Amino acid sequence: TGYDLSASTFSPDGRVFQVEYAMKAVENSSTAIGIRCKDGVVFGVEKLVLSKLYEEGSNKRLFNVDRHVGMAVAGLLADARSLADIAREEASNFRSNFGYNIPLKHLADRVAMYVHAYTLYSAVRPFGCSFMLGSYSVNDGAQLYMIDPSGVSYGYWGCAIGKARQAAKTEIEKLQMKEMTCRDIVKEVAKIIYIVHDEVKDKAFELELSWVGELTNGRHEIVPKDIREEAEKYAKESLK
Amino acid sequence: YDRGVNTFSPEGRLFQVEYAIEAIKLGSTAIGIQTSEGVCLAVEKRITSPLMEPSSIEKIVEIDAHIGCAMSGLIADAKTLIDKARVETQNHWFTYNETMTVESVTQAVSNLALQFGEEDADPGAMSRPFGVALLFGGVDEKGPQLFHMDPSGTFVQCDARAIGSASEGAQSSLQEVYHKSMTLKEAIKSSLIILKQVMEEKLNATNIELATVQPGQNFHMFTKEELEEVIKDI
Amino acid sequence: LHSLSTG
Amino acid sequence: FEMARTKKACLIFFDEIDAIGGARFDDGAGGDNEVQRTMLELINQLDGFDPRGNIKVLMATNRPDTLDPALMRPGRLDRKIEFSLPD
Amino acid sequence: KRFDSEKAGDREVQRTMLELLNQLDGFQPNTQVKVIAATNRVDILDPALLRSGRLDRKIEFPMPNEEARARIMQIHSRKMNVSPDVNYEELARCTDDFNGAQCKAVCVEAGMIALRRGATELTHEDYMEGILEVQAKKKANLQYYA
Amino acid sequence: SYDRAITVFSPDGHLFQVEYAQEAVKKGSTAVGVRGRDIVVLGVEKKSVAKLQDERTVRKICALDDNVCMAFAGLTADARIVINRARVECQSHRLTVEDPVTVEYITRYIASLKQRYTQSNGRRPFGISALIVGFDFDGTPRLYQTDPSGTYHAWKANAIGRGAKSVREFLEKNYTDEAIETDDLTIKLVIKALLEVVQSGGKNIELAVMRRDQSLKILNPEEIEKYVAEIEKEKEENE
Amino acid sequence: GYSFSLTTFSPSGKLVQIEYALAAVAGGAPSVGIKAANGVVLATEKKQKSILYDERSVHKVEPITKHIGLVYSGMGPDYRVLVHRARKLAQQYYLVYQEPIPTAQLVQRVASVMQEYTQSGGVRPFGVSLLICGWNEGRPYLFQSDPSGAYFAWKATAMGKNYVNGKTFLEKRYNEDLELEDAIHTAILTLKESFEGQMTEDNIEVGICNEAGFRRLTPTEVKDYLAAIA
Amino acid sequence: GSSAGFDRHITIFSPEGRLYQVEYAFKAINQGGLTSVAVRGKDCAVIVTQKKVPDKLLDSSTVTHLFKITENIGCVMTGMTADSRSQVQRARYEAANWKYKYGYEIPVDMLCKRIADISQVYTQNAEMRPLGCCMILIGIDEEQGPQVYKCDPAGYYCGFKATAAGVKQTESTSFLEKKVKKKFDWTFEQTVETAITCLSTVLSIDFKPSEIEVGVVTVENPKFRILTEAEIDAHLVALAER
Amino acid sequence: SRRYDSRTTIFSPEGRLYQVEYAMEAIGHAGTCLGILANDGVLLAAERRNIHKLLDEVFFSEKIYKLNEDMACSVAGITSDANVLTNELRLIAIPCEQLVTALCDIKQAYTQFGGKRPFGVSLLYIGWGFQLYQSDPSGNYGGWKATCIGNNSAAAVSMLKQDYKEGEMTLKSALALAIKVLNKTMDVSKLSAEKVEIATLTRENGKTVIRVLKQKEVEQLIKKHEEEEAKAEREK
Amino acid sequence: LNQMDGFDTLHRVKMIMATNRPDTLDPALLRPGRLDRKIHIDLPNEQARLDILKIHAGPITKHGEIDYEAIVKLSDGFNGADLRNVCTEAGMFAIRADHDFVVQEDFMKAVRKVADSKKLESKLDYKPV
Amino acid sequence: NQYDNDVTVWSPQGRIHQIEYAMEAVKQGSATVGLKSKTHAVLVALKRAQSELAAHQKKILHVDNHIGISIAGLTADARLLCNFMRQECLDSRFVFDRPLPVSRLVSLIGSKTQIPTQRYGRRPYGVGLLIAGYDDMGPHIFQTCPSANYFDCRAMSIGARSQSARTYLERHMSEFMECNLNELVKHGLRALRETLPAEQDLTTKNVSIGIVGKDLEFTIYDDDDVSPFLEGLEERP
């Protein structure tokens, strides 16, 4: 019909269909969840292996846009890495100009505006990835924001992006995240990721775990392998 | 039309590149042969009128004292590639006091291909691929060498390669008559024989161009007398 | 100019 | 297709199938709705709930890019023979 | 979908659709007849037809994934004399963006090719080469790549 | 800046914009160039000669330099730009090399400019074909033809424009060494070739010659009328 | 931005986008410009769709210099852009020449901008017609600049909705001996003929240019002039 | 509703002189499903908007269509959230630039005048689409007093005694017009109650002090403040008891 | 971007530039403009289409503009593009042919690259010997003794071709010819002075004088022409 | 049209007409002389969605607290058939887990599934002209 | 056919068809296999010749002293990417006096190849790369796609009929780590054999082997130097 070929064209119902197609690109990817607990934020990713040939760590959907901010992506991994570099340069510029670590609210509001800059012109296409930025600090506290292809950044307690986003949100709502700590939230994130995974459909997934909280002194790091394996065992046992 | 120049077909083909490759089949037939005694380049002038001067139809070009080029297709498009070859050469000599490898010249010319675009391009950037096919022939440390270049920027060394309108039949004849250990005179005679059987007109010392790059000797365009000497046989 | 725009 | 099924073996040739085989679209108005219904009926006859029978169809078109994806699907057009220009 | 026009329109087919809508969920609640519908383009349907009283469950049928493609090929190779060396997993890996009909056509064309060379048993090469036929890739001389 | 590929390859392998420019040339007035022994002659059909038209301003034969002049066929406005660029480069080459340009050099520059306009973003090809005649530094007369594609060739005699095919056919038959023995015979050959297409006669012929070590000389209408009278007289004795 | 012209010549030799911009102009609020012997009057129908709109917040009749003013018919935002452009051009002329720009020169520059928007790449013509009133050399000046960038010197004219009948009314109601107050009366009558409902001191905007310069009439003065009508 | 060419795909005129892309941008405002109401009083201006939190997972502290453009100027955004954030950031930049270049706080009318000038370019150049958002700015002026300005995708702008944007813009406009016809210079409490009553009556929600955001500016303190849930609850109880 | 591009500067399959032809069609609907050369001066006679009774008359001329101290021009087509071209003409300005060549170079460049629509304006230039030139949107210019552009240009050119005695004209005979032609080209059977615009360029005291005739002089010319036509009718 | 409002006045006969596309109706039919009132049966609001959910979840066998408010919050844009479908899908999730009752989690899954299925529906905002 | 003409047009299914079309260019290219061990990373490329009178097109390019690639697809785009990577590796030496890590180089190339996949009038690089390198982290095999998405693979294979090589690599992936260099090269050659038709066989003319190791510089072996690797493997069944 011609109303969806460009992002600079409005539909007669006032909707930019290119942005919606970019959102569907995100909805076609595997589910990544993130839960903001009492003393940090925990990111979990159901990173499927498309073949046994890829090494353990390829296509890392958990990024480190700063020393205190982690990024969980879902959708086009090339656009995801481009946005990860954009966020990295935004945090670097914030540190080089103002002299301190960028607040998660400001980093989210800046990367979201960079994303929105690609939803107005026919010279470019909207980003085909949605990403969650999570951080923790003693002053600001645990923060978790999600940014979609349109550029809408919203703070969250528990969020999920991917094809099993609704089921993951339903499982997340059962949690009393506002009271429990990271050491339990990692186990629950593993349980949710294992629950929403579809073994008869695309199978053989890897659990990518990361966190940022007071137990890491406000530093985003990959969850240690021992804790990750304990969470994996708990998640497998929870499936009976 | 709706398509841009930098558009991929569902089969993975660059549309404009394939369309430029189709332009060579309308060009005149050129035949290059590489032998241990040298590189022989031949091309048909395809004279369209007795009034046209054959000497002005230059389709074999001195790239440098050790390298020549035979072009087929859109000859006007080949002028830019020839100029870049002749300027890129003597720039290697300027900085290193040595003649370029034929492979290096062909690679430098190949880098020009695919350097076209519509948006996000320089004002001097080209708009379409070069609808010409080039046959570089020269002498370097690796002895005589013949390279074929096509509008896709894919250059490859060839023992004996035929481009142009009669590329298929001339290539088949080259495969039938080429052996690795043969003299340059045999190569010239075989190329002339293959040309004579594919020309629309009758072969004479005026409607064809012959050139040779031999070790020791320089690039040499065959004169009318030299052409008649080898044509008088066949 | 500024006054005209503002008033 | 009813009279084609009254024969043990039958061939149907659809010359210039792009006349009715165009892809379905919604242009606000009733753009090519009836022709789309004809194409849908042809598709249902080719591969639907009921078996087609011993009918082997054959369509020729110079505009295959305009054909509906459901018509260009195996089970309705299993073989796609390209009549490219001769070498 | 119904539309508003001043000059012409397909009001008769819309009347038939409105009768269908009334039958599905209208004045007389018919709760003894089950209704199943199928379509390729749900974006064309009238929103009154996609209602949650007429079509409660709208099941999406996706492209068969790798395991599904292998399963479909195995299903359609049951009545076929296939050698015990075909790698249906490899065939599934080679059939990206193939629907179930194309997966069945892969087996059909493999049988075609096995008959073409006179073999009485289908080999993995027959399936691999019939994948090319089902792909229907246009003829290309792209031997200058790499 | 407008950066769109105006000239792109057709699926057939053709540059359709170049072919359309050549068609625009084919819609132009017939220009004939003949390279003689010591003279080069350029005769252009004047299309229609309105009595109110200042014939000085509408001139399809223009001298690029003191030794080079060209006659075009095609879009007059494009031809003016090509002529101006060629004149500027002729002056630049004279400044640099301290030698008047050769016919090959200016022809090559014109063809290269045309090819650049057939391969640049946002530019349509020049819709003119040129017949460039002149004398080299050694006194050799030279005639060259360039087309909108950017390909140029040397010709003993040639014609461009609407009547190009028939005039070239005539020239292929009557261009002989005897026919170019003298300047008068060369001019008569040019006028005959133009009369093969021109209907009214000498009224629609603008003829300009160039002799060795001389500037371009435009023939006055009475001279062309005298030449046409000579050809008409010679026609009778051959019957 | 696009580098290709969005306004092109139709096969019938018409700049179609300019005609469509003129059609947009003809759908705007009526505007009347009358050049009297001692000044010019620009009147317009500044009618809102609700009382919630602040009538005095935005003005359709805006000054450009101390002696030049504009009133538009067409699209509001385009007129605001052209108002800023006209003011900037007037400031440039004043800075160069240390003298307020003549009305004709400002009209020419503004029309040049409007034409530039009919030929430049990736832009549409302004959907406004500008009535420009000024006072120079002890003489009044009235001009109309259309979307195409063409300017006309008008003794009296009307633009916008019902502008043809307004023009016909002005032919039978204007003479060169009119005074400024009678010109205001005639302009208010011209608006009233195309007006629907009643004209209050707030739903129309009137400005006048005389030897004292250009000034937009306050609502009280418009109220007095309207009470003069009835 | 005639069309000719790309008049529905880019901001060029239709045969009847309409910019369909701008009208579609206007329709994009209702895509968010939210309605905002701004009411101006004798010495105060109030913006109220419904905040929707579909699930407890969403951090309700971040779902805010009320943005503090400057200390003395506030705004409420209606429409696409990303375009709303873009317009808010641009308005903040323009306010800061005005303060730097001219030395005094930007007037509320001029802020939306500049924003509408920015958004008019989107309706003239074809390479970009208009922002599908509507800004309502409120602020206390030095002399004019309270000021409310709606600021639409077309580059149109006007002052308002009371305006509304979003899905229920017309019903709220009718309600506020009926209230204004009574010609009462409302006090601060009266303006807040009028805005809350407009939103509630039009939406029929019977608000709780967690479903609406209220931001006020008053002459006594010419600063934009977002009312807390207790402050909103006070007005809700006052409305309920009457 | 490619979707919305109209490709103004391209070649049609027949070798024509459609935008240039459409601009010429636009000029064909413009006001009639005449240019006549004489032995002592040149004249431009443009039909005035801005003939509304409420149109103020403040400008020195409507379609006739002064480019320099030696030249004048008249336009047919889009008036705003005419203003742009005349401003550029004044900026460039000099021999008449050089000025026409420069403006035509700009006009041609607009038809070769840039993607913009061409200047839909045809110009008639008069200057000082005395010379008259005509330029088209394509950038193709040509000198003339008598020429016409705009409405009924073909009929005017035929009338001049039949009536223009080459070489033997003064300013008076050329003015009479201009009135005679304009009477037939315009649909008005009377051709009042308010619907025409005559400007003459002549060499006086070694200086170029470009003067637009007053309405009284034009009425005198019309009266003389109608009296001569009545005298011709006296024969029949 | 001649029967609703024509030459013969209609006495003691009332006409109720229902449509979900009133934009396509003939202007004479929509004329207030024939269709005097135009009652907009709009999509349910929060309280209306709560009422419809309580109506349709009434006969559903449940144990545990049922927070209808959460389903209302996540039911934005739903219609009455949407909420009946929410109850039906909650019961269907109960059946799929082999249960004789419905809990709040089943309602959560049902409402999210119905919201997902709502993305295929085109424009519904149609009003008489 | 309206959603596939440009790289900035999202299809309604959330796919960019121009990117997939560029990805098919790699599938049109000749097969190549890159596999790594505990200490080595090797690439085996099956060169193709347009005609038997023309040389086989080179597929393995030397990028740096420790990094070398195998190309599949457009040779000119491959040369552009190889020049970019050579320049990046050279700049790393010029700045930090250290080799550029392979993981940190593939990231730069995946960021470079992503820019054309988002801007109007640009096209994705119609070349797929198999990068074999060695660094402090050991050997690395990376696969770079026209979609600008790269994978860190234990053993990858791209090109025409490369999925048979993928199957062979998956079958024998367990023994890649502990095998020596000769066994690794034999595994690569055996994997590449699966991409050939039944009648074809690996010869010196159409096999190129690029090897990088802990103490071994990246070296490319051709017809004369491939024989010490080819003669060991036995004839396939």
Q: How far apart are CA E55 and CA E20, in angstroms?
A: 12
Q: How many helices (H) and strands (E) does chain C have?
A: 1, 0
Q: To one decimal place, what's the resolution in Å?
A: 2.7
Breaks (C-N over 2.5 A) in chain H follow: none
Q: Cβ separation of F17 and I105 shorter than 8 Å?
A: no
SS (H, E, C) chain A: CCCCCCCCCCCCCCCCHHHHHHHHHHHCCCCEEEEEECCEEEEEEEEECCCCCECCCCCCCEECCCCCEEEEEEECHHHHHHHHHHHHHHHHHHHHHHCCCCCHHHHHHHHHHHHHCCCCECCECCCCEEEEEEECCCCCCCEEEEECCCCCEEEECEEEECCCHHHHHHHHHCCCCCCCCHHHHHHHHHHHHHHHCCCCCCCCEEEEEEEEEHHHCCCCEECCHHHHHHHHHHHHHHCC
Out of D47, D70, D79, whose CB is closest to E40? D70
Out of J47, J73, J77, whose CB is closest to H55? J73
Q: How far apart are CA I13 and CA J109, in angstroms?
A: 63
Interface test with F, best of B49, B112, B115 (most F CBs within 10 A): B49
Tally of domains within chain B: 1
CA distance D27 to chain A (A): 6
Closest-CA residue in chain A for D24?
A1
8-state DSSP, G126: P
Q: How far apart are CA I88 and CA I81, in angstroms?
A: 11
Q: Is A100 exposed, middle or buried (0-12, 13-18, 19+ CB in 10 A)?
A: exposed
CB contact G64 to C (< 8 Å): yes
Q: Cβ separation of B2 and I3 shorter than 8 Å?
A: yes
Contacts with E144 from chain B: Cβ below 8 Å: 150, 152, 154
Structural domain boundaries of chain I?
Answer: 1-234
Helices of type H across chain G: 16-26, 76-97, 103-116, 163-171, 180-194, 219-229
Q: How far apart are CA A52 and CA K171, in angstroms?
A: 10
8-state DSSP, J118: G
Question: CB under 8 Å to I189, separation ≥6 — which residues?
Answer: none
Closest CA to H176 of H36, H71, H59, H22: H36
Buried b (16+ CB within 10 A) or exposed e, I92-126: bbeebbebbbbbbbebbbbbbbbbbbbbbbbbbbb
Q: Is A226 exposed, middle or buried (0-12, 13-18, 19+ CB in 10 A)?
A: exposed
Q: Is C3 exposed, middle or buried (0-12, 13-18, 19+ CB in 10 A)?
A: exposed
The CATH number linked to H98 is: 3.60.20.10
Q: Cβ separation of I1 and B2 shorter than 8 Å?
A: no
Alpha-carbon separation of residue A79 from A76, A119, J96, K113 (angstroms): 5, 14, 39, 11
Query: Do the beta carbons of residue H15 and residue G10 sit within 8 Å?
Result: no
Q: Cβ separation of J47 and H203 shorter than 8 Å?
A: no
Q: Is E6 exposed, middle or buried (0-12, 13-18, 19+ CB in 10 A)?
A: exposed
Please, what are the domains in chain K? 1-234 (3.60.20.10)
Q: Is 3.60.20.10 the CATH classification of the domain at A1-238?
A: yes
Q: Cβ separation of I114 and G3 shorter than 8 Å?
A: yes
Residue G51, amino acid: I
Alpha-carbon separation of residue F72 from F61, F124, H227, H239 (angstroms): 7, 18, 81, 89
Query: Do the beta carbons of residue G13 and residue I26 sit within 8 Å?
Result: yes
Contacts with G104 from chain I: Cβ below 8 Å: 58
Structure tokens at H49: 């908007």
Closest CA to F39 of F134, F132, F103: F134
φ and ψ at residue J47, rounded to 5 degrees: -65, -40
8-state DSSP, E6: S
Tally of domains within chain F: 1
Residue A53, amino acid: L
Helix or strand run (H / E) with residue H120: helix H108-122
Closest CA to G118 of G18, G13, G218: G18
Identify the sign of the CA torsion E29, E34, E39, E42. Answer: positive
8-state DSSP, J32: T
Mode of pairing for the β-strands spanning D10-15 and D55-60: parallel
Q: How far apart are CA D27 and CA B29, in angstroms?
A: 52
Q: How far apart are CA K23 and CA A99, in angstroms?
A: 43
Chains A, H: CB contacts within 8 A come to 102
Query: What is the domain extent for residue F239?
Result: 1-239
Contacts with A4 from chain D: Cβ below 8 Å: none
Closest CA to A208 of A108, A70, A3, A38: A70
- DSSP-assigned states of every residue in chain F: ------S-B-TTS-BHHHHHHHHHHHTSPPEEEEE-SSEEEEEEE-S---TTB-TTTS-SEEESSSSEEEEEEE-HHHHHHHHHHHHHHHHHHHHHHSSPPPHHHHHHHHHHHHHHHTSBTTBPPP-EEEEEEEE-TTS-EEEEEE-TTS-EEEBSEEEESTTHHHHHHHHHHH--TGGGSSHHHHHHHHHHHHHTT-SS-GGGEEEEEEETTS--EEPPHHHHHHHHHHHHHHHHHT-
CB contact J23 to H (< 8 Å): no
Q: How far apart are CA G192 and CA B52, in angstroms?
A: 81
Tally of CB atoms within 10 A around F237: 6
Query: What is the domain extent for residue H29?
Result: 1-242
Closest CA to A81 of K127, K107, K120, K119: K107
Structural domain boundaries of chain A?
Answer: 1-238
Query: Do the beta carbons of residue G52 and residue G155 sit within 8 Å?
Result: no
Query: What is the domain extent for residue B190?
Result: 2-234
| 3-state secondary structure (DSSP) of residue I55 | strand
Contacts with A5 from chain I: Cβ below 8 Å: 3
Alpha-carbon separation of residue B88 from B94, B107, B213, F64, I58 (angstroms): 10, 11, 19, 32, 66
Residue F140, amino acid: T
Contacts with G6 from chain F: Cβ below 8 Å: none
CA distance H1 to chain G (A): 13
- DSSP-assigned states of every residue in B63-119: EETTEEEEEEE-HHHHHHHHHHHHHHTTTHHHHHSSPPPHHHHHHHHHHHTT-B-SS
Helix or strand run (H / E) with residue K163: helix K162-171
Which chains have 3 or more CB–CB distances shorter than 8 Å to chain C?
G, H
Structure tokens at F142: 């030279």
Q: Cβ separation of E5 and D24 shorter than 8 Å?
A: no
| 3-state secondary structure (DSSP) of residue B233 | coil
Alpha-carbon separation of residue A152 from A115, A119, A165, F13, H85 (angstroms): 9, 11, 17, 48, 8
Q: How far apart are CA H30 and CA J21, in angstroms?
A: 20
Query: Do the beta carbons of residue I64 and residue I197 sit within 8 Å?
Result: yes
Edge-to-edge order in the sheet of strand F205-211: F157-160, F31-35, F39-45, F205-211, F217-218
Closest CA to A83 of A35, A120, A117, A48: A117
Closest CA to F192 of F157, F222, F161: F157
Q: How far apart are CA A107 and CA A124, in angstroms?
A: 23
Question: CB under 8 Å to K197, separation ≥6 — which residues?
Answer: none
- DSSP-assigned states of every residue in chain D: -TTTTTSSSEEEEEETGGGT-BPP--BSB-TTHHHHHHHHHHHHHHSSSS---SEEEEEE-S-GGGB-TTTTSTTTS------PPP-
Q: Cβ separation of E40 and D33 shorter than 8 Å?
A: no
- Out of 3.60.20.10, 3.30.70.270, 3.40.50.720, 3.40.50.1820, the CATH code matching I1-234 is 3.60.20.10
Helix or strand run (H / E) with residue B156: strand B155-157
φ and ψ at residue K208, rounded to 5 degrees: -130, 135
Contacts with G62 from chain C: Cβ below 8 Å: 4
Alpha-carbon separation of residue I224 from C3, I179, I196, I229, K98 (angstroms): 60, 9, 16, 9, 99
Residue F216, amino acid: L
Tally of domains within chain H: 1
The CATH number linked to B67 is: 3.60.20.10
Question: CB under 8 Å to K50, separation ≥6 — which residues?
Answer: B156, E143, E144, K57
Q: How far apart are CA H90 and CA G2, in angstroms?
A: 23
